[PDB]
């Protein structure tokens, strides 16, 4: 029984009481239907009962025609009143520069008598006075409305106890006929007064809580007003957001009130009688933009965490169509079946970005979208699935940002649109929403105390519920040039390790552009230090931490392997701090228990023709910030062979016979040095070859090895 009383995007509240009931209008801007009315009995448990209108206007901006929109605009702050048996609801819109008035004797069922006129009065608060005139404030200005509401002859006005209090930081204006600071706390502003039958006062207001949107707040009021002891809440399901099996009894609302379209729907192109138990979105138009697509169906996202889901059927789809689930704003995130490949897109940046792509060989497919708003971390994880339960992660994390436009919370979104060919369809069996979260995925976690992307890692647990998981780290091949390719490492190893029962931790390291060696190994050891220190939190059994990587990721994993317990080292004139002071957990161990090295470079003194150094242009020259031939000491210091001993971990080195960037010989140099001191478990020489083209058998041996050393 706490605040926020609604952890969801319900901005520009206009609230009132009528007996034992509470009512509240709201802003959804460019959604259809518009101006949602919500009912409550306790000020705590809310539910949608009605909307003021279906569509606002039949104009290109509102209809998403001719590449035009009205995102952020549409129906804005409304005014809700009850006077002598009739409910009175007003809003305005810059989308048509008009003010609209709606009246009914039953706020839940209707019907509405409607009127409209120009201009739009900005955040107007109309009021019935006991002098018998209908006033209206806005901006601030005062004026008198006509009787039949066909024209005129965050302001919210309330007369209490024969004094006029206008709400607008919150700033109340008192007056006897028709100025202080009353609240200044986390910018929780805009609203008015509401009383309880027993005479307790509250101020209904909202905060900007980031991605989730703009969330209602109730504050107790004492008497001037001076800004929870209310019944127990039962969340926002099914009041504000609900699941839908898309099954309808005789004469039932076709779409629960929880549903609102993006802009004016094309009501020709969706149906619930096409396939009984299924929603069928059909295409009408070829699009160049996701946000110019019609018949995107939506509910709100909810805090503090949430998860949406769907089941689809792709048989109907045509060449170039794209239908799935979205976390939807300007900076959106998709996951769906494009034509068939399962695909994620990340539209954070201007151009959309297809991240990962799996082929589909079924027609029934599932999707899931998670949201972590907890302390405004504001991240969206997408998954797919071919099955009821077995959820396969896909693509990067969506770093949600509350942008303007669309000036709205992130919504779940069912979509299906064409790029090449119209007529195709996509069935949806159900939509499912829950206030739970898996917490089997944390991406873009900082393992040092900085914002640098070089110091970011992604955690992944197996979804098989177990108190703790043994860890395996992934480093990426970049020739030490990338600080941002931990996502690529996951797509290669991730799934296979996860099925065996391993927690996976792909990490980033600072590029050779950012810093020079030993920055790269300093980072690896810091990521590991972080894992142990935060182990309890992410259910990580750090009795075992494996580590692996391809090319430079193999190099760094190997160098990590041989330097267990090594603080520094000195060859010739050159010393090199091998552990570092990157994070804030130097207390903890940077050890690893098992290494697998995929065709990593090792000895750059024999990198060229298995003999000599390379030029000042080669990746190793960039890594040390110096010309290899003349920095022969430093090349040995970053060589893992240097640090091999009997009590180092077991290794598995793997390398193709036709690898044209890192030769054969590098791995063999390493495996011989190891095996001599009993460290090499297995050297694997793939006849195929090539720097990556990594197969069923080689992959399976990685798993079986990590499993043997872990148990
Ligand atoms: Na050693």
From TrEMBL:
CDD domains found in the cross-reference section: GH43_FsAxh1-like (cd09001)
Gene3D superfamilies, per the entry: 2.60.120.200, alpha/beta hydrolase, Glycosyl hydrolase domain, family 43
Annotated BD-FAE-like domain residues: 457-674
Domain Beta-xylosidase C-terminal Concanavalin A-like, residue spans: 244-434
Any Pfam family: BD-FAE
Protein EC: 3.2.1.37
Site features described as Important for catalytic activity, responsible for pKa modulation of the active site Glu and correct orientation of both the proton donor and substrate, chain residue numbers: 123
Listed InterPro entries: AB_hydrolase_fold, BD-FAE-like_dom, ConA-like_dom_sf, GH43_C2, Glyco_hydro_43, Glyco_hydro_beta-prop_sf, Glycosyl_Hydrlase_43
Enzyme class, UniProt record, top EC level: hydrolase
Keyword vocabulary terms for this entry: Glycosidase, Hydrolase, Signal
Gene Ontology biological-process annotations: carbohydrate metabolic process
GO molecular function: xylan 1,4-beta-xylosidase activity
Xref: SUPFAM superfamilies: alpha/beta-Hydrolases, Arabinanase/levansucrase/invertase, Concanavalin A-like lectins/glucanases
Active-site residues annotated for this sequence: 12 (proton acceptor)
Family statement: Belongs to the glycosyl hydrolase 43 family.
Protein name: Glycoside hydrolase
Source species: Bacteroides eggerthii
Biological classification of the source: Bacteria, Pseudomonadati, Bacteroidota, Bacteroidia, Bacteroidales
Gene name of this polypeptide: xynB_2
């Amino acid at each position: 029984a706490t605040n926020p009383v609604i952890y969801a995007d319900a901005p520009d509240m206009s609230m009132l009481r009528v007996g034992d009931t509470y009512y509240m209008s709201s802003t959804t801007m460019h959604m259809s239907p518009g101006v949602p009315i919500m009912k409550s009995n306790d000020l705590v448990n809310w539910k949608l009962v009605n909307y003021a209108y279906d569509t606002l206007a039949n104009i290109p901006t509102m209809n998403l025609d001719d590449g035009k929109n009205t995102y952020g605009r549409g129906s804005w702050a409304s005014c809700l009143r009850y006077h002598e048996g009739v409910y009175y609801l007003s809003t305005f819109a810059q989308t048509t520069g008009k003010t609209y008035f709606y009246t009914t004797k039953n706020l839940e069922k209707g019907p509405w008598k409607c009127t409209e006129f120009s201009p739009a009065y900005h955040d107007h608060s109309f009021f019935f006075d006991e002098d018998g005139h209908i006033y209206m404030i806005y901006g601030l200005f005062l004026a008198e409305l006509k009787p039949d509401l066909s024209g005129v002859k965050g302001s919210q006005l309330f007369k209490v106890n024969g004094k006029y209090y206008l709400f607008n930081t919150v700033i109340v204006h008192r007056a006897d006929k028709i100025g202080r600071v009353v609240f200044q706390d986390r910018g929780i502003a805009q609203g008015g007064l509401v009383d309880t039958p027993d005479g307790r006062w509250f101020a209904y207001l909202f905060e900007d809580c980031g991605a989730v949107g703009r969330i209602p707040y109730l504050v107790p009021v004492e008497w001037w007003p001076v800004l929870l002891e209310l019944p127990d809440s039962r969340g926002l399901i099914p009041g504000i957001v609900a699941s839908d099996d898309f099954n309808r009894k005789k004469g039932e609302r076709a779409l629960p009130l929880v549903w609102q379209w993006n802009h004016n729907p094309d009501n020709a192109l969706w149906s619930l009688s096409a396939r009984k138990g299924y929603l069928r979105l059909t295409t009408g138009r070829m699009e160049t933009s996701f946000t110019q697509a019609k018949n995107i169906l939506t509910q709100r996202t909810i805090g503090p965490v949430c998860t949406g889901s769907v089941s689809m059927d792709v048989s109907g789809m045509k060449e170039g169509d794209f239908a799935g689930l979205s976390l939807f704003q300007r900076k959106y995130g998709q996951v769906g079946v494009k034509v068939k490949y399962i695909v994620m897109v990340n539209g954070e940046n201007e151009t959309p970005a297809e991240v990962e792509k799996v082929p589909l060989n079924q027609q029934v497919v599932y999707f899931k979208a998670e949201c972590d708003f907890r302390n405004k971390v504001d991240k969206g994880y997408f998954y797919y699935s071919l099955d009821g339960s077995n959820w396969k992660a896909i693509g990067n994390v969506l770093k949600m940002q509350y942008t303007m436009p669309h000036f709205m919370g992130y919504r779940f979104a069912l979509f299906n649109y064409a790029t090449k060919e119209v007529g195709g369809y996509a069935d949806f069996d159900y939509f499912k929403i829950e206030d739970k979260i898996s917490d089997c995925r944390w991406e873009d976690i900082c393992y040092a105390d900085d914002k640098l992307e070089g110091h970011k890692l992604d955690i992944y647990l197996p979804d098989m519920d177990e108190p703790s998981y043994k860890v395996v780290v992934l480093i990426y091949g970049s020739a030490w040039f990338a600080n941002n390719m931990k996502q690529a490492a996951f797509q290669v190893f991730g799934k296979s390790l996860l099925d065996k029962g391993f927690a996976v931790v792909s990490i980033n390291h600072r590029s050779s552009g950012d810093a020079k060696f030993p920055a790269q190994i300093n980072d690896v050891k810091a990521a590991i230090r972080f894992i142990r220190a935060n182990a309890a939190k992410y259910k990580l059994d750090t009795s075992f931490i494996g580590i692996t990587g391809f090319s430079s990721g193999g190099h760094l994993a190997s160098l990590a392997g041989t330097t267990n317990g090594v603080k520094s080292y000195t060859i010739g004139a050159k010393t090199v701090d091998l552990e570092g002071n990157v994070g804030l957990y130097p207390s903890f161990s940077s050890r690893v228990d098992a290494v697998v090295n995929w065709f990593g470079p090792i000895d750059m003194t024999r990198m060229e023709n298995c003999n000599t150094t390379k030029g000042a242009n080669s990746p190793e020259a960039a890594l040390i910030g110096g010309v290899p031939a003349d920095n022969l000491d430093m090349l040995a210091l970053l060589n893992p062979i240097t640090y091999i001993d009997k009590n180092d971990p077991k290794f598995i080195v793997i390398h193709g016979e036709a690898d044209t960037v890192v030769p054969n010989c590098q791995s063999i140099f390493f495996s011989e040095a190891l095996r001599a001191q009993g460290r090499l478990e297995e050297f694997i020489s793939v006849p195929g070859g090539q720097h990556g083209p990594f197969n069923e058998n080689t992959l399976k041996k990685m798993i079986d090895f990590f499993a043997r050393e872990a148990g």
